[PDB]
């Protein structure tokens, strides 16, 4: 209930999956997108 | 760069020559260690000009 407010606690942020498997004790900074695809991203819903 | 951390040896001697590296033995005690949280993959010097 401490971190609990009835409007809601959306600052808290989670990378759903990475290209490769994080090693122990390692920090990642970087908010890079995947290029799952050829094509770039550009940030854009384009190709995966 | 190992378990998040940066050791440093040192070791000083004087020298009378000017070719290279002498023909002796030297141990390097540890004098440092401080902790760096990323993974290096490349690094460069610095010389005063």
Known sequence: ?48 | NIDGYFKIYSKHTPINLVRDLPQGFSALEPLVDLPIGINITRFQTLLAL
């Open chain 1, 1 to 48: 209930n401490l971190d609990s407010k009835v409007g809601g606690n959306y600052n808290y942020l989670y990378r759903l999956f990475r290209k490769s498997n994080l090693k122990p004790f390692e920090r990642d900074i970087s908010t890079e997108i995947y290029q799952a695809g050829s094509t770039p991203c550009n940030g854009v819903e384009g190709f995966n």
